[PDB]
Amino acid sequence: GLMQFTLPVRLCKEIELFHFDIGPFENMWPGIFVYMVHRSCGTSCFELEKLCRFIMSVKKNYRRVPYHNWKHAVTVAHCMYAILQNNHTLFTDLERKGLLIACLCHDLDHRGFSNSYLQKFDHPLAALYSTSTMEQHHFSQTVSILQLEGHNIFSTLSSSEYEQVLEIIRKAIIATDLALYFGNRKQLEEMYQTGSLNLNNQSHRDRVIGLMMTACDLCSVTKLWPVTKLTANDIYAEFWAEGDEMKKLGIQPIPMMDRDKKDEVPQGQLGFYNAVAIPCYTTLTQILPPTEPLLKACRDNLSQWEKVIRGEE
Ligand SMILES: CS(=O)(=O)c1cccc(-n2ccc(=O)c(-c3ccnn3-c3cc(F)ccc3F)n2)c1
Ligand SMILES: [Cl-]
Ligand SMILES: [Mg+2]
Ligand SMILES: [Zn+2]
């Protein structure tokens, strides 16, 4: 039990900060995640043998796509770690366990295509799961991996603790469907502003955990500008591949996905910051004040894109 994961000094210090980038060394990402579980949760909350085997099976079931890959999973898990560590006392033992795993597993077996493309292609997954298509698949994949021999990291939880954590993970992964984000945030905005928000109301927690998941998922817009700008290439590589596939189905894609309209990206980023990312981190900061650094970094990156449009870069 007395085996700690230890990171070089720079990573040890910077991993605590919201804007940490996990770096280009793939083989350090597992250690970085176990490190975050040990500090967030405890060295006893998982059997290392089972955790390690769970992490490497999850890694294996992420695909070699430009953005929705293993690096994305660990990046989203790290943002969640930063939130839990800046909000120590507000979350239960089970919520800390469930949510880091939820974040690691939230895009399992992503193919690089939106729910929309699956529906218009008429993919079997779109028949199995009529809404939040990929997110139901992601949870399904999470459950399948937990059930491989020697992979059940929740074994030593009671039957009711176990049912609770799988329920936390299911809602967390479903909430990463950005189509559900708009309504979730509207409701949390209303409840905060009437003083009706109660963290003892489970269905209020559910919504707050929902908004944290959107925050962690979108967290590439909260990094130092050079990280944010370079992730955007990966994001748009997937978008333009989906646009190509739309044109193959005979559908003109939205401009976001059309690689012909590559000139419109800077304005498209402003819309996304203004319509999605700024509202998301604003409402998160209202509910969880210590997550303000995510709103601040997001605002800095909005300004960086405004400079791109104004020809200053
Ligand atoms: C038209 S809309 O409903 O506003 C809508 C639907 C889907 C994607 C975007 N969108 C546009 C521009 C971006 O930069 C991102 C972005 C930034 C960080 N993560 N993501 C992201 C988020 C996802 F959910 C999926 C894939 C992603 F790259 N997302 C907008
Ligand atoms: Cl601590
Ligand atoms: Mg997803
Ligand atoms: Zn994601």
mmCIF file of N, CA, C and O in Angstrom, residues 27-81:
data_model
loop_
_atom_site.group_PDB
_atom_site.id
_atom_site.type_symbol
_atom_site.label_atom_id
_atom_site.label_comp_id
_atom_site.label_asym_id
_atom_site.label_seq_id
_atom_site.Cartn_x
_atom_site.Cartn_y
_atom_site.Cartn_z
ATOM 1 N N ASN A 27 3.130 7.602 -22.326
ATOM 2 C CA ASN A 27 3.390 6.513 -21.344
ATOM 3 C C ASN A 27 3.413 7.092 -19.926
ATOM 4 O O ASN A 27 3.351 6.324 -18.975
ATOM 5 N N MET A 28 3.425 8.407 -19.778
ATOM 6 C CA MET A 28 3.263 9.018 -18.439
ATOM 7 C C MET A 28 1.785 9.271 -18.098
ATOM 8 O O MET A 28 1.538 9.561 -16.932
ATOM 9 N N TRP A 29 0.838 9.170 -19.043
ATOM 10 C CA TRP A 29 -0.574 9.562 -18.772
ATOM 11 C C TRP A 29 -1.214 8.633 -17.738
ATOM 12 O O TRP A 29 -1.926 9.121 -16.858
ATOM 13 N N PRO A 30 -1.012 7.286 -17.794
ATOM 14 C CA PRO A 30 -1.547 6.391 -16.767
ATOM 15 C C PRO A 30 -1.087 6.762 -15.356
ATOM 16 O O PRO A 30 -1.934 6.858 -14.467
ATOM 17 N N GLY A 31 0.217 6.971 -15.185
ATOM 18 C CA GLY A 31 0.791 7.391 -13.898
ATOM 19 C C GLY A 31 0.147 8.683 -13.419
ATOM 20 O O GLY A 31 -0.213 8.771 -12.233
ATOM 21 N N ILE A 32 0.010 9.665 -14.311
ATOM 22 C CA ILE A 32 -0.612 10.990 -14.018
ATOM 23 C C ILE A 32 -2.049 10.764 -13.523
ATOM 24 O O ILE A 32 -2.496 11.439 -12.569
ATOM 25 N N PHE A 33 -2.783 9.843 -14.132
ATOM 26 C CA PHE A 33 -4.175 9.578 -13.696
ATOM 27 C C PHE A 33 -4.182 8.868 -12.332
ATOM 28 O O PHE A 33 -4.959 9.260 -11.466
ATOM 29 N N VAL A 34 -3.364 7.839 -12.128
ATOM 30 C CA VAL A 34 -3.323 7.138 -10.810
ATOM 31 C C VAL A 34 -2.927 8.157 -9.733
ATOM 32 O O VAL A 34 -3.570 8.172 -8.675
ATOM 33 N N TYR A 35 -1.920 8.981 -10.015
ATOM 34 C CA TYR A 35 -1.446 10.073 -9.133
ATOM 35 C C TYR A 35 -2.628 10.925 -8.701
ATOM 36 O O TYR A 35 -2.724 11.232 -7.507
ATOM 37 N N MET A 36 -3.483 11.291 -9.653
ATOM 38 C CA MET A 36 -4.670 12.158 -9.416
ATOM 39 C C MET A 36 -5.720 11.411 -8.585
ATOM 40 O O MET A 36 -6.363 12.051 -7.757
ATOM 41 N N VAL A 37 -5.865 10.105 -8.780
ATOM 42 C CA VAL A 37 -6.795 9.267 -7.977
ATOM 43 C C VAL A 37 -6.245 9.181 -6.551
ATOM 44 O O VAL A 37 -7.030 9.346 -5.618
ATOM 45 N N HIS A 38 -4.946 8.944 -6.377
ATOM 46 C CA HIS A 38 -4.337 8.767 -5.031
ATOM 47 C C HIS A 38 -4.551 10.035 -4.191
ATOM 48 O O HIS A 38 -4.925 9.884 -3.012
ATOM 49 N N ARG A 39 -4.396 11.223 -4.789
ATOM 50 C CA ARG A 39 -4.424 12.539 -4.092
ATOM 51 C C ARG A 39 -5.867 13.030 -3.906
ATOM 52 O O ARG A 39 -6.140 13.750 -2.924
ATOM 53 N N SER A 40 -6.754 12.674 -4.833
ATOM 54 C CA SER A 40 -8.166 13.129 -4.903
ATOM 55 C C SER A 40 -9.040 12.266 -3.988
ATOM 56 O O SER A 40 -10.096 12.745 -3.520
ATOM 57 N N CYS A 41 -8.622 11.020 -3.773
ATOM 58 C CA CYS A 41 -9.496 9.897 -3.359
ATOM 59 C C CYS A 41 -8.855 9.097 -2.220
ATOM 60 O O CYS A 41 -9.580 8.740 -1.295
ATOM 61 N N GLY A 42 -7.551 8.828 -2.308
ATOM 62 C CA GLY A 42 -6.785 8.012 -1.351
ATOM 63 C C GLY A 42 -6.096 6.869 -2.068
ATOM 64 O O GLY A 42 -6.557 6.491 -3.163
ATOM 65 N N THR A 43 -5.045 6.317 -1.468
ATOM 66 C CA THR A 43 -4.250 5.194 -2.029
ATOM 67 C C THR A 43 -4.981 3.862 -1.856
ATOM 68 O O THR A 43 -4.521 2.871 -2.453
ATOM 69 N N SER A 44 -6.055 3.842 -1.064
ATOM 70 C CA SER A 44 -6.800 2.622 -0.658
ATOM 71 C C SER A 44 -8.103 2.479 -1.446
ATOM 72 O O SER A 44 -8.691 1.380 -1.390
ATOM 73 N N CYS A 45 -8.567 3.537 -2.121
ATOM 74 C CA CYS A 45 -9.919 3.557 -2.737
ATOM 75 C C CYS A 45 -9.975 2.583 -3.929
ATOM 76 O O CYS A 45 -11.092 2.150 -4.260
ATOM 77 N N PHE A 46 -8.831 2.174 -4.500
ATOM 78 C CA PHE A 46 -8.761 1.133 -5.564
ATOM 79 C C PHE A 46 -7.584 0.191 -5.313
ATOM 80 O O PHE A 46 -6.592 0.668 -4.780
ATOM 81 N N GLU A 47 -7.704 -1.088 -5.692
ATOM 82 C CA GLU A 47 -6.562 -2.038 -5.777
ATOM 83 C C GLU A 47 -5.750 -1.637 -7.017
ATOM 84 O O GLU A 47 -6.309 -1.665 -8.144
ATOM 85 N N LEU A 48 -4.492 -1.247 -6.816
ATOM 86 C CA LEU A 48 -3.590 -0.788 -7.901
ATOM 87 C C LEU A 48 -3.641 -1.784 -9.065
ATOM 88 O O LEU A 48 -3.765 -1.326 -10.201
ATOM 89 N N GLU A 49 -3.566 -3.089 -8.787
ATOM 90 C CA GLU A 49 -3.563 -4.166 -9.818
ATOM 91 C C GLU A 49 -4.820 -3.977 -10.687
ATOM 92 O O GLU A 49 -4.691 -3.918 -11.933
ATOM 93 N N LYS A 50 -5.991 -3.836 -10.059
ATOM 94 C CA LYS A 50 -7.292 -3.686 -10.769
ATOM 95 C C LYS A 50 -7.350 -2.323 -11.479
ATOM 96 O O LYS A 50 -7.849 -2.249 -12.626
ATOM 97 N N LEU A 51 -6.858 -1.266 -10.838
ATOM 98 C CA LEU A 51 -6.957 0.090 -11.416
ATOM 99 C C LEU A 51 -6.117 0.110 -12.695
ATOM 100 O O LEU A 51 -6.674 0.436 -13.774
ATOM 101 N N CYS A 52 -4.853 -0.298 -12.584
ATOM 102 C CA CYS A 52 -3.878 -0.332 -13.701
ATOM 103 C C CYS A 52 -4.477 -1.103 -14.877
ATOM 104 O O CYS A 52 -4.411 -0.593 -16.011
ATOM 105 N N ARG A 53 -5.083 -2.259 -14.610
ATOM 106 C CA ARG A 53 -5.687 -3.135 -15.652
ATOM 107 C C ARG A 53 -6.930 -2.446 -16.242
ATOM 108 O O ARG A 53 -7.184 -2.566 -17.461
ATOM 109 N N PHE A 54 -7.675 -1.721 -15.420
ATOM 110 C CA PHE A 54 -8.843 -0.936 -15.888
ATOM 111 C C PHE A 54 -8.352 0.212 -16.797
ATOM 112 O O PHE A 54 -8.857 0.356 -17.910
ATOM 113 N N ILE A 55 -7.342 0.972 -16.371
ATOM 114 C CA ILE A 55 -6.786 2.138 -17.133
ATOM 115 C C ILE A 55 -6.301 1.662 -18.511
ATOM 116 O O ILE A 55 -6.617 2.324 -19.522
ATOM 117 N N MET A 56 -5.569 0.549 -18.567
ATOM 118 C CA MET A 56 -4.944 0.089 -19.832
ATOM 119 C C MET A 56 -6.009 -0.503 -20.771
ATOM 120 O O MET A 56 -5.872 -0.320 -21.987
ATOM 121 N N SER A 57 -7.058 -1.149 -20.258
ATOM 122 C CA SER A 57 -8.202 -1.603 -21.096
ATOM 123 C C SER A 57 -8.982 -0.389 -21.614
ATOM 124 O O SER A 57 -9.428 -0.430 -22.789
ATOM 125 N N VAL A 58 -9.132 0.661 -20.799
ATOM 126 C CA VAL A 58 -9.843 1.896 -21.251
ATOM 127 C C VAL A 58 -8.994 2.554 -22.348
ATOM 128 O O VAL A 58 -9.559 2.834 -23.445
ATOM 129 N N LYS A 59 -7.691 2.732 -22.110
ATOM 130 C CA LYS A 59 -6.758 3.248 -23.143
ATOM 131 C C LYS A 59 -6.966 2.460 -24.447
ATOM 132 O O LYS A 59 -7.149 3.090 -25.503
ATOM 133 N N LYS A 60 -6.971 1.130 -24.382
ATOM 134 C CA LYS A 60 -7.046 0.263 -25.579
ATOM 135 C C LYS A 60 -8.326 0.562 -26.359
ATOM 136 O O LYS A 60 -8.271 0.429 -27.568
ATOM 137 N N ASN A 61 -9.422 0.953 -25.699
ATOM 138 C CA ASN A 61 -10.766 1.095 -26.330
ATOM 139 C C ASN A 61 -11.011 2.536 -26.799
ATOM 140 O O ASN A 61 -12.083 2.786 -27.357
ATOM 141 N N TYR A 62 -10.040 3.433 -26.628
ATOM 142 C CA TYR A 62 -9.981 4.732 -27.343
ATOM 143 C C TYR A 62 -9.261 4.522 -28.669
ATOM 144 O O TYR A 62 -8.340 3.707 -28.738
ATOM 145 N N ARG A 63 -9.716 5.221 -29.696
ATOM 146 C CA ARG A 63 -9.263 5.053 -31.086
ATOM 147 C C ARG A 63 -8.229 6.123 -31.402
ATOM 148 O O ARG A 63 -8.103 7.079 -30.631
ATOM 149 N N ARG A 64 -7.525 5.929 -32.511
ATOM 150 C CA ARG A 64 -6.433 6.803 -32.986
ATOM 151 C C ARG A 64 -7.081 7.883 -33.850
ATOM 152 O O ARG A 64 -6.838 7.910 -35.056
ATOM 153 N N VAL A 65 -7.937 8.696 -33.251
ATOM 154 C CA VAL A 65 -8.624 9.813 -33.954
ATOM 155 C C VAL A 65 -7.945 11.106 -33.517
ATOM 156 O O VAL A 65 -7.306 11.164 -32.459
ATOM 157 N N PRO A 66 -8.075 12.197 -34.298
ATOM 158 C CA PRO A 66 -7.282 13.400 -34.054
ATOM 159 C C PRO A 66 -7.564 14.090 -32.709
ATOM 160 O O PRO A 66 -6.641 14.691 -32.189
ATOM 161 N N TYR A 67 -8.793 14.010 -32.184
ATOM 162 C CA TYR A 67 -9.200 14.760 -30.960
ATOM 163 C C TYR A 67 -9.803 13.825 -29.910
ATOM 164 O O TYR A 67 -9.326 13.903 -28.775
ATOM 165 N N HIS A 68 -10.823 13.028 -30.253
ATOM 166 C CA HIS A 68 -11.604 12.184 -29.301
ATOM 167 C C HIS A 68 -10.810 10.926 -28.932
ATOM 168 O O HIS A 68 -11.307 9.797 -29.075
ATOM 169 N N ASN A 69 -9.623 11.129 -28.405
ATOM 170 C CA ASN A 69 -8.614 10.071 -28.204
ATOM 171 C C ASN A 69 -8.304 9.961 -26.704
ATOM 172 O O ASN A 69 -8.967 10.652 -25.878
ATOM 173 N N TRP A 70 -7.359 9.081 -26.385
ATOM 174 C CA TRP A 70 -6.855 8.781 -25.025
ATOM 175 C C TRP A 70 -6.354 10.066 -24.356
ATOM 176 O O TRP A 70 -6.624 10.236 -23.157
ATOM 177 N N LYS A 71 -5.670 10.959 -25.084
ATOM 178 C CA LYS A 71 -5.161 12.249 -24.511
ATOM 179 C C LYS A 71 -6.338 13.103 -24.026
ATOM 180 O O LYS A 71 -6.214 13.724 -22.959
ATOM 181 N N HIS A 72 -7.435 13.134 -24.782
ATOM 182 C CA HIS A 72 -8.674 13.869 -24.423
ATOM 183 C C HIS A 72 -9.233 13.316 -23.107
ATOM 184 O O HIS A 72 -9.502 14.122 -22.199
ATOM 185 N N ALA A 73 -9.359 11.995 -22.995
ATOM 186 C CA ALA A 73 -9.869 11.321 -21.781
ATOM 187 C C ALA A 73 -9.091 11.792 -20.547
ATOM 188 O O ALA A 73 -9.719 12.134 -19.511
ATOM 189 N N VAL A 74 -7.764 11.778 -20.623
ATOM 190 C CA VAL A 74 -6.922 12.049 -19.429
ATOM 191 C C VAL A 74 -6.992 13.551 -19.150
ATOM 192 O O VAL A 74 -7.124 13.941 -17.975
ATOM 193 N N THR A 75 -6.981 14.365 -20.190
ATOM 194 C CA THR A 75 -7.130 15.832 -20.055
ATOM 195 C C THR A 75 -8.441 16.145 -19.321
ATOM 196 O O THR A 75 -8.409 16.977 -18.401
ATOM 197 N N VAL A 76 -9.552 15.514 -19.708
ATOM 198 C CA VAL A 76 -10.891 15.779 -19.088
ATOM 199 C C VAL A 76 -10.878 15.323 -17.619
ATOM 200 O O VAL A 76 -11.433 16.058 -16.763
ATOM 201 N N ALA A 77 -10.252 14.183 -17.327
ATOM 202 C CA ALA A 77 -10.070 13.651 -15.957
ATOM 203 C C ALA A 77 -9.271 14.649 -15.106
ATOM 204 O O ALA A 77 -9.657 14.884 -13.947
ATOM 205 N N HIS A 78 -8.202 15.222 -15.649
ATOM 206 C CA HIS A 78 -7.366 16.201 -14.923
ATOM 207 C C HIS A 78 -8.197 17.445 -14.555
ATOM 208 O O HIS A 78 -8.133 17.877 -13.398
ATOM 209 N N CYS A 79 -8.947 18.032 -15.485
ATOM 210 C CA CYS A 79 -9.831 19.188 -15.164
ATOM 211 C C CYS A 79 -10.743 18.836 -13.975
ATOM 212 O O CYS A 79 -10.871 19.668 -13.061
ATOM 213 N N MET A 80 -11.316 17.633 -13.959
ATOM 214 C CA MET A 80 -12.243 17.193 -12.887
ATOM 215 C C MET A 80 -11.472 17.128 -11.569
ATOM 216 O O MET A 80 -12.028 17.573 -10.548
ATOM 217 N N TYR A 81 -10.251 16.580 -11.600
ATOM 218 C CA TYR A 81 -9.320 16.526 -10.443
ATOM 219 C C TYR A 81 -9.128 17.945 -9.881
ATOM 220 O O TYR A 81 -9.303 18.137 -8.683
#
